[PDB]
Write a protein that binds this DNA or RNA. Structure first.
Ligand SMILES: [Mg+2]
Length: 410
RNA sequence: AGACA
RNA sequence: UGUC
């Protein structure tokens, strides 16, 4: 066992060219207050609806005003009004109607307070909203035993993003890392049932385009996986047409058919064709990686964040979070296009990249033990699946630009 | 469904 | 079962 630590001087870029170090929520929020987030969403109506059945509850109220002052002071979204809508019974139809009222009054976003756990209701409403407008759900029974300050700080991180905002991105070296990173693969709905996903990222960690395949039979996996990728690269190029792609990386993950060696060839085929369709430089350097969780990592005898453990020249363990125990990410170099002189240098770039992408979750102020390239699609699968199992409204990427371009799944 | 181990 |  041989190991190397990721170079540990790196920063987020927020508003007005300011930088803040990572892993320090204090200086991030202070930075946001002064400089604003990297990109302030443009809202049409300057209006958010708050939809709940709580009376004149003094809780909706401290909430309301905390949302209100933070959205303005932390996020720099000005002149925002929150209108409230109240529903009789916590049943679907009753809440939906308050959704529709809100909508035809002209709202940029809906915050929806549910009373308790209730999975069929939640996924039915979320499904409706995702096709309609950016949404942030809430539970009153969680909102009651949590410190408001923590709950709102975090809640807004992802609500701002769903509104098209960009809280913060990575400060990247233009030279090092991939031009784009494609998170790809599939997750199991049922046992005969598959959906494929393909999501394109910039090395600063921002999602550019998101494509999802039809819920399809497991047999036809290798078909829609190849299909879906092409579609992401198509939709990304039409949107970024003068952007030469010389370094491509694939991040393959999710619970999918166990047909690996054949999965590999087809991703190679998918690339060669993208070359010949002049969507990617004719001499693209690329790598195809499997990222997987594994067993917790124990250093014995009496493990720093960003530690890269070489299990073999194709397999690495990468630690994403400080042990203060730790589940690392398993990263396999399944296939590549690299000369051998480069190779070692390219591996570590690609492992550094993964480590940085793990600091890029927009669900809140604490980032997941995953790179966004694996986490985001996992949250997709999350929603697509329950929308299947609970009879919600189908989610359709082709049919409008905002779903292919916004992190609706946070 | 505020999230994170 | 914990953390803010
Ligand atoms: Mg969420």
């Amino acid at each position: 066992m041989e190991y190397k630590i990721v170079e540990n001087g790196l920063t987020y870029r927020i508003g007005n060219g300011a930088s803040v170090p990572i892993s320090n929520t204090g200086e991030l929020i202070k930075g946001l207050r002064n400089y604003g987030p990297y990109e302030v969403p443009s809202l049409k109506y300057n209006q958010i609806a708050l939809i709940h059945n709580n009376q004149f509850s003094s809780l909706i109220n401290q909430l309301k005003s905390q949302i209100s002052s933070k959205i303005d002071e932390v996020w720099h979204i000005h002149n925002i009004n929150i209108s409230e809508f109240i529903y009789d019974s916590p049943h679907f139809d009753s809440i939906k109607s308050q959704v529709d009222n809100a909508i035809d009054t002209g709202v940029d976003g809906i915050m929806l307070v549910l009373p308790e756990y209730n999975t069929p209701l939640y996924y039915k409403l979320k499904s409706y909203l995702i096709n309609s407008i950016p949404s942030q759900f809430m539970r009153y029974d969680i909102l009651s035993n949590r410190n408001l300050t923590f709950y709102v700080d975090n809640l807004l991180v992802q609500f701002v993003s769903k509104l098209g905002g960009k809280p913060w991105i990575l400060n990247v070296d233009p030279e090092k890392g991939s031009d784009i990173i494609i998170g790809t693969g599939a997750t199991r709905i049922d046992n005969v049932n598959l959906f494929c996903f393909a999501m394109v990222f910039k090395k600063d960690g921002t999602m550019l385009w998101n494509e999802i395949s039809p819920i399809v039979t497991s047999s036809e996996y290798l078909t829609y996986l190849k299909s879906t990728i092409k579609k992401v690269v198509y939709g990304f190029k039409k949107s970024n047409p003068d952007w030469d792609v010389e370094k491509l990386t694939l991040h393959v993950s999710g619970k999918r058919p166990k047909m690996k060696d054949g999965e590999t060839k087809i991703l190679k085929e998918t690339v060669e064709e993208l070359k010949k369709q002049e969507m990617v430089s004719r001499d693209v350097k690329y790598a195809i990686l499997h990222l997987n969780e594994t067993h917790p990592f124990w250093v014995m005898g009496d493990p720093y964040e960003g530690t890269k453990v070489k299990l073999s020249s194709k397999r690495y363990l990468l630690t994403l979070l400080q042990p203060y125990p730790i589940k690392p990410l398993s990263v396999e170099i399944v296939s590549d296009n690299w000369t051998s002189e480069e190779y070692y240098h390219n591996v570590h770039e690609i492992l550094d990249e993964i480590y940085y992408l793990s600091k890029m979750n927009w669900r809140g102020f604490r980032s997941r033990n995953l790179p966004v390239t694996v986490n985001y699609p996992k949250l997709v699968a999350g929603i697509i699946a329950n929308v299947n199992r609970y009879g919600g409204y189908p989610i359709n990427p082709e049919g409008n630009r905002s779903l292919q371009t916004n992190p609706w799944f946070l």
